[PDB]
Design a protein around this ligand. Sequence first.
Ligand SMILES: C=C1/C(=C\C=C2/CCC[C@]3(C)[C@@H]([C@H](C)CCCC(C)(C)O)CC[C@@H]23)C[C@@H](O)C[C@@H]1O
Length: 253
Amino acid sequence: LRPKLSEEQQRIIAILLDAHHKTYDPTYSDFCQFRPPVRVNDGGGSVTLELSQLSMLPHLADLVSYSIQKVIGFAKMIPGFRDLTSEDQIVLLKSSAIEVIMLRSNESFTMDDMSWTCGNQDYKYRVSDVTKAGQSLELIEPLIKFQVGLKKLNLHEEEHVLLMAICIVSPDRPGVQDAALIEAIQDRLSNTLQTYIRCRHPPPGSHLLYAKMIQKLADLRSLNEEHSKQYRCLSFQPECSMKLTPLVLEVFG
Ligand SMILES: C=C1/C(=C\C=C2/CCC[C@]3(C)[C@@H]([C@H](C)CCCC(C)(C)O)CC[C@@H]23)C[C@@H](O)C[C@@H]1O
């Protein structure tokens, strides 16, 4: 069976596409406003040197902080999100922030050279640039594999935005009060996605794709946990707080 998208479902997709278009600048034109990226000579991938300098942290922390703000904006536009209490809204945002950033970054990720390309060389982020931000390969390598796998799904933008929405509105986040309401909202979203794939996504991908996308959400949980572990280590570095931002400190602290 391939039930047609209901008027409500079509409206949901429209709202999410619009929300994404208003919160994700494909030209990355604001990036020049972030603290400048600095790339020290670390061909050896020296953890000691990376931690001593954290040369790329101010820039990437600003990029992440900026992205969290955009995600907050996107989330507020998710149909039903505002029906939740502010406490639940914040619980969901803080817990999904890094995951949505990883998902949305797939738009700048390119398999041409396995980097996040957001402009000229200055705004091209490679594994080496992330390690220069004090991040561990224990996180970055799996992150890259995740990006490639997500790339290969060749998601329509409709699927991309629905996946980010579903990621955010997850009832199984620690601290949520009204898990029931959250699940109802997510189910409305998941049903839209499943319905969209079944009647709009041409094979060989008409089906099976929903399962692959849901698996990505599971992968994201592991990446989230891995990032939290690495962020903790990074936080031990003296003077690190100044290289981050208040929003970043709050979300991951
Ligand atoms: C942000 C966005 C972009 C890229 C994402 C990247 C590339 C650089 C390194 C990042 C920011 C990863 C880092 C492991 C996260 C480190 C954060 C912290 C220093 C606080 O522990 C996660 C996603 C990666 C650019 C654009 O796609 C908008 C998107 O929204």
